[PDB]
Amino acid sequence: ENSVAYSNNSIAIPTNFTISVTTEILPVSMTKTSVDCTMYICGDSTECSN
Amino acid sequence: KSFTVEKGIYQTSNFRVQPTESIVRFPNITNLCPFDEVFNATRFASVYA
Numbered sequence: 001e002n003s004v005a006y007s008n009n010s011i012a013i014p015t016n017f018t019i020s021v022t023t024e025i026l027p028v029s030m031t032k033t034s035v036d037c038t039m040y041i042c043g044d045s046t047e048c049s050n
Numbered sequence: 051k052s053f054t055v056e057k058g059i060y061q062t063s064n065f066r067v068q069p070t071e072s073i074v075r076f077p078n079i080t081n082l083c084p085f086d087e088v089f090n091a092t093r094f095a096s097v098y099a
């Protein structure tokens with residue numbers, strides 16, 4: 001808790017400065033993939049293939 | 051499923067070699083036994099027997 005003062009005719013002014021650095025990270029893409037239905041759904045049975 | 055192909059790259063299929071021979075491997079004994087004789091038993095026992 002840090003309450004700021006208030007008055008009719010009072011202001012505040014800085015007299016010095018400094019420089020800082022900051023980092024940010026963003027995803028851009030995912031890993032592609034591919035599938036062939038026949039191999040996965042049916043191993044070798046010819047009747048299954050028909 | 052058409053006659054005309056536009057330029058680009060396509061994936062048709064995956065090549066698969068097909069089988070040629072059939073192989074069976076079993077243990078090695080060639081003797082008969084009383085299977086039929088157990089079936090053809092003169093007297094048949096009970097469940098408790």
Ligand SMILES: *[C@@H]1O[C@H](CO)[C@@H](O[C@@H]2O[C@H](CO)[C@@H](O)[C@H](O)[C@H]2NC(C)=O)[C@H](O)[C@H]1NC(C)=O
Binds near residue numbers: 016017018
């Ligand atoms: C403003 O602040 C900077 C620091 O952020 C002050 O510079 C430092 O001053 C002290 C006091 O002599 C030195 O020990 C430090 O080495 C100074 N910093 C650097 C990076 O050298 C600066 O003095 C302040 N402004 C005024 C007018 O005093």
Ligand SMILES: *[C@@H]1O[C@H](CO)[C@@H](O)[C@H](O)[C@H]1NC(C)=O
Binds near residue numbers: 007008
């Ligand atoms: C500020 O001004 C108002 C009128 O504008 C007055 O009532 C008040 O007493 C003054 N002082 C403070 C501290 O608010």
Ligand SMILES: *[C@@H]1O[C@H](CO)[C@@H](O)[C@H](O)[C@H]1NC(C)=O
Binds near residue numbers: 078079
């Ligand atoms: C079956 O074949 C194996 C390997 O040749 C041999 O070790 C074994 O004696 C054979 N059994 C019979 C009953 O011939």
